[PDB]
């Protein structure tokens, strides 16, 4: 299993659809409209995010910036406990 | 019939929204945030606990300690009198 | 006409959307979770236990227990009609 | 009959949608994206995953992981019986 | 043009979704599952049953039972009004 | 007319599409991938398996297994009937 | 250039499946099953009808009745235009 | 572009849905059920309307009759303005 | 004009694809698996019935079962007016 | 690479299924309802408009028009982009 | 190299198989049955019309006819196109 | 093994239908309409590319182009290290 | 009449071309490529190997190995059939 | 018998027509394309490569390489399965 | 061994039926009716062009006009090496 994938399932399983549709307003420039529509889960849009090198198991400045204006400090920590086991 | 399940819906019907509000608090570890969201009733959170092997019909001290924690005992007293006939 | 599919039918017309909700925790143990998600009224759970032999005209018993503890005796009364005029 | 097979589909008779899009992302590095596509069913995924030897019915680790992700632990109690019968 | 087909059309055409399945359903004994599979408007049932005499045009007996299980009693009027110009 | 015949053609045309995939399933290891493409319904999936043996007149354990899997217990009543006949 | 047969190709080319099924349904009598299966387009309906003389270009009553049928009365406007021009 | 198609497509833009029940609910007796299930805008309407010859450039008396028993004097204006420039 | 063939080729232009699967499958026992392989439409199998005299104008049961078998009253009514006119 | 083709490309990748609804709509008098049934992207609807030369690189009037209807001046902005390197 | 032969060739490079089969149709008076059934592409349509002097290099009325009948505009330029050369 | 064509068929097996169709939109001015239709996946495309000399294993620049106007920089990377290894 | 060639014109008789197709591969090594050109039926094949002395009425390995490459049981119970009474 | 043989014709059985087509392309350079367009199964194209001396019993490479893009791992286990024996 | 017969079989063996079809079509006012339907392959063609000296060693000019209606730039650059060793 891979454990930026486990990372991302266990960090998309604790969020709400409030948060869901600020995540998807702050990836406007980022994301075309149409490939927005079909975002119904954390999972989408991290897939998405993946597949254009956004978003890599070396590189979590967007993932942190997006925590962090959600306020959701308690899974920056686990996207801190993440990163010292994979050094 | 299915008396594990029957006195499970017996409880469920007994609880308001604010009891359910509350169990819905006492369980912020147990559940995920995204899994709690869709939580209606006691029936959707118990069914979830029984898919993780938190409530069995053999092991209820969970359900005892969140109906203790509302403070009722005449749910509880239902609990006793399943256990009994279960022996 | 088959008389069962008719009362069958006339007892699914009598129901909620929060009945439908109860009756299909009741059957947990019965039918699998993949299947149940396709119930959307009470035809599809009856025909799913008609095909499991759960359900027959000559067997009624966890009908009648569904529907009773659901609180619903006026439909008991209607299975109780059926089964007089089918002696 | 093969125990395995059986075991397979009873598994997979036991799994909704949401559960489903969460197993396809946890295989995101395993399977291709065109035939990650045709998956509607545990099933599809499972045999996927045999014709690779990711699953076998002397290794089990990858089934394990993955239902661990799911917190279904009544999935695993069922994963946990297969084996002691076939020891 | 045979009346009765334009009968028939107009009143598949006079239907919604929920009245199809309901109509499926009361039809279980006389279809097999894989045919009534295949069902996606009232044509398609009606043009089955007039393959197995069930509906003709001399006996409307059975159109005339699942119109009023529907408690349609405008398409029975239709039905009436067909008859009438046909003795 | 064969009485077996007759009775896989009436079993085969009670199943849906997905009875069918879930069949498919289960005999991987008896027919071929290549075979197995070929199937779209019933009737040749049981064709295939008349000519390898595995289904025979006085010998049907193999579609009552199939049938159980399914939870399809009218069919298992039809299989019943059929064997009684036949003694 | 027909006028018949570009009138023809311009009804057909403003049809949608639908309205192509419910077509096919009103021409049970007419045409056989058979024939019937091949149909994919209203031209392939119009050559059938065309072989059998139900339509003609002087000839045009079996299609304004099932124009009407379907409610549209625009493309009765155009089979008007027609024979206006092929007076 | 049809002024008349942006004209529509103007009105329908300014209704809400309870404005596109009401509007439905008016049209009981022109369209048929089967076919006002699939209305989901103004703009469905107005499609099945055109095909049946009700709505014209030069024949707006059922728009304006529907527009009237809404109580929406603004897109009467509109309607007025379109006829003013198509004289 | 042989009467039987017109009525065997009525009967045959009145079949779809899948009751001609549906058929070849019941004539397992009957015809060999190359003759069947060539067989494209209702006539082939006739053909093939009729060199082996098990089709005969004064005898029809295998074509009566074989039409029961599909459920096909029609066409039986077919065979029997072809028998009234023939005694 | 074709820059029109990018062009296109990328206001199709910009647009929902509401907007290409109002597409769709606005096109009615220009493509057949028999080819718009098949319209699922912009893409669809933009080819259908170059094969009838109704969109040019040169010609460009219909596609402003549809966009300022759909009150998108950021997708305007870009076909302005797009004339000023092709001058 | 014919400049007409290749003209024609490049016309039947850039035709689908629902534009072959409304080419088809509307030849229904020009070619037999028999003959139009081996047109599996445009350039046998072409020979059969080159063959019968309804296509010459300096006659090209009825392909200009069935280009506008398909709406096929581009083509209608390349078609413009070799006239002009061919002066 | 061709080291080329290893790359297109890993590039290949990592589409989705939608790419696939957004690639045949970008390519409608190198391939013909008629060519087009056969394309059911990336393989198909990319040998027709590679008979017209429009892909190479030393020109790859329009590959390049497609999978940037795709957003697919995963697979760029993939392009990217061919070229280092075949330098 | 020989049992031996009336055994394997039996056998012959239920296979299908697929069948042959494989049966002519596993005989590659055992007979030319010009005179397996020549065969279009498992006569021709037996033929050919009742002369090289492969295939003789005491010694049917060969055949029972071919008839397990293709699963088919059923003819080697008439094969087993015809050893017990050539004994 | 054939060893070598019956394992290429175990192998080509345990393949879908996708995979057939995957294959195909993989041999662009070492199969013409007139002899490619022969090529319906798994046998045909290994009885090119026998023939052209790639494909011999001491010589696997490149079957295991073929095996290998395709990621079916358990064929290959049968191909290493066929060389312990053949050491 | 002649160098031009050879690079004439190379590229007759590159070519498929369809593209054999066009070029039968473009070589219609050059190859009479009667000596074109014997044409199965490129060779065929190749022949009757060579007698006909349309087709020399040293005059390829109608061999390269064939290839570039067929956008087969591969085989003209076979073409172009064959010139070159041949200067």
Same mark, same amino acid.
């Not at 998405?48 to 400090?73: C, F, I, K, V, W």
């Given at each position: 299993?891979?454990?930026?994938?486990? !990372? #991302?399932?266990?960090?998309?399983?604790?969020?709400s659809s409030s948060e869901l549709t600020e995540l998807k307003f702050l990836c406007l420039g980022r994301?075309?409209?149409?490939?927005?529509?079909?975002?119904?889960?954390?999972?989408?849009?991290?897939?998405?995010? #993946?597949?254009?090198?956004?978003?890599?198991?070396?590189?979590?400045?967007?993932?942190?910036?997006? #925590?962090?204006? !959600?306020?959701?400090?308690?899974?920056?920590?686990?996207?801190?406990?993440?990163?010292?086991?994979?050094?």
């Open positions: 299993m891979d454990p930026f994938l486990v !990372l #991302l399932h266990s960090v998309s399983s604790s969020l994301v075309g409209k149409r490939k927005l529509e079909r975002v119904q889960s954390g999972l989408d849009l991290f897939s998405m995010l #993946l597949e254009q090198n956004d978003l890599e198991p070396g590189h979590t400045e967007l993932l942190r910036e997006l #925590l962090a204006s !959600l306020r959701r400090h308690d899974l920056l920590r686990r996207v801190d406990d993440f990163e010292a086991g994979a050094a």
